[PDB]
Amino acid sequence: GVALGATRVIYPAGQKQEQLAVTNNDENSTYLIQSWVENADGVKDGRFIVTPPLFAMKGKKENTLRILDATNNQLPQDRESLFWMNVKAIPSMDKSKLTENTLQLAIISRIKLYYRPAKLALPPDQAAEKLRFRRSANSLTLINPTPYYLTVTELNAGTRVLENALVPPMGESTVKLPSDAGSNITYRTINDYGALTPKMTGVMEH
């Protein structure tokens, strides 16, 4: 079966292209691999080009997808922009047509593509600690004052686990607070390398 080498792509502004590994570990399988980029709404977006857009992987091998910036430098320079990298694996093996009806599947893996401006002052590995919280009776708002998207997870209020949240740069995201939510907030994030960051204590706004 097919896997990708990363669960997100950080695209550094100014690079002509960014690489993403795609692998098949099965000698006895052949796949067609089709790749494209979508905007945050999931709409195919030509502002990034993927090469090769369509190719065959026969058996056990690794290949490299190249994601090319075609934004003409029009994206914001003070914060990340969110796109989605899509990699479809089409099983391309010589099956035999049965008398049976079939439901035929193909697989698409979708990972975040963060376009990251150059020369941001705050380091990425200091962004998670800057998250702040605003609390009402029935909701919790997450406040991200950094230029980076924060993927907030294992968000706890007391013993009550809350929904995960993607908090946009210099923006906010709100989740529901169940009745039994406690006052001590903790959270983690998923970092540039797909790893969970240390448990942090939530700090209230102002």
């Binding site: 097919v2 099983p91 093996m93 979708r110 990972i111």
Partner: protein
């Protein structure tokens, strides 16, 4: 971290749906026998597999946007689609935003669902894309 290596039932990722007996459907919404299938998420950290949303995409039946179309044409069955369910009997409508559950094996059920009053027999194939959206 790597994404999950996705594998289905057979290497061709084909789910055998059986044969249509058109006279067994008597009302819109009636379902045929359950066809279980499993999608495995292999060789990835639980950090990753616990944080993936899934969706099924395809051409919807013209009368029921929640189920897959079996197409149209000579010798093609009419007034049924392919409905998808999670392992708790809940319908998974196609073409919806990624959905989460709470393991590295996702168990689903496919059934033929009557979308029209008078079902006719014939070939009843469907196609879908299973999308995994990683946090």
């Amino acid at each position: 971290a790597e994404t999950c290596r996705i594998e289905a039932g057979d290497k061709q990722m084909t789910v055998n749906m059986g044969q249509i007996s058109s006279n067994r459907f008597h009302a819109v919404g009636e379902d045929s026998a359950p066809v279980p299938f499993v999608i495995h998420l292999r060789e990835c950290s639980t950090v990753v597999s616990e944080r993936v949303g899934v969706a099924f995409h395809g051409v919807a039946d013209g009368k029921n946007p929640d189920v897959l179309s079996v197409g149209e044409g000579p010798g093609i069955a009419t007034n049924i689609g392919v409905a998808l369910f999670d392992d708790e009997g809940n319908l998974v409508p196609i073409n919806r935003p990624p959905a989460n559950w709470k393991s590295t094996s996702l168990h689903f059920i496919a059934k033929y669902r009557a979308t029209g009053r008078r079902v006719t027999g014939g070939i009843a194939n469907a196609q879908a894309w299973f999308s995994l959206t990683y946090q």
